[PDB]
């Protein structure tokens, strides 16, 4: 679920999902169009594609379970949708952590009109 993803993001990066990732660049928190602005935005682009791979799942609300094995995120077995959603969120959280070194506050609340053109998953 969105709330669980937010907690995962905070655990991983030390930033609050809202507002650090909820409105960042062209794809974070409200995906869609344009060339991702930086590596963090690309994390969101891929995460959007990942959710897009699951048209008959409901990643905003469906809850999954996961644990930490010394640092590592381990998605525990739930329904097929839950497992797949968890893997999408895990990847994004890791991606955000891997790209904290470039994260730029100037991309928070990035305006829609600067995001133009479709980029294929």
């Amino acid at each position: 679920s969105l709330l669980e993803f937010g907690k995962m993001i905070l655990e991983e990066t030390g930033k609050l999902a809202i507002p650090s990732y909820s409105s960042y660049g062209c794809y974070c928190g409200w995906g869609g169009k344009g060339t991702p602005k930086d590596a963090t935005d690309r994390c969101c682009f891929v995460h959007d594609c990942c959710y897009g791979n699951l048209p008959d799942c409901n990643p905003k609300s469906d809850r999954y379970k996961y644990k930490r094995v010394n640092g590592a995120i381990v998605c525990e077995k739930g329904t097929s949708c839950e497992n797949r959603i968890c893997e999408c969120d895990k990847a994004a959280a890791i991606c955000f952590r891997q790209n904290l070194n470039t994260y730029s506050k100037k991309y928070m609340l990035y305006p829609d009109f600067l995001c133009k053109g479709e980029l294929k998953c």
Binding site: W30, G31, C44, D48
Partner: peptide, 4 residues
């Protein structure tokens, strides 16, 4: 919200 939308797309992801």
């Amino acid at each position: 919200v939308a797309r992801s």
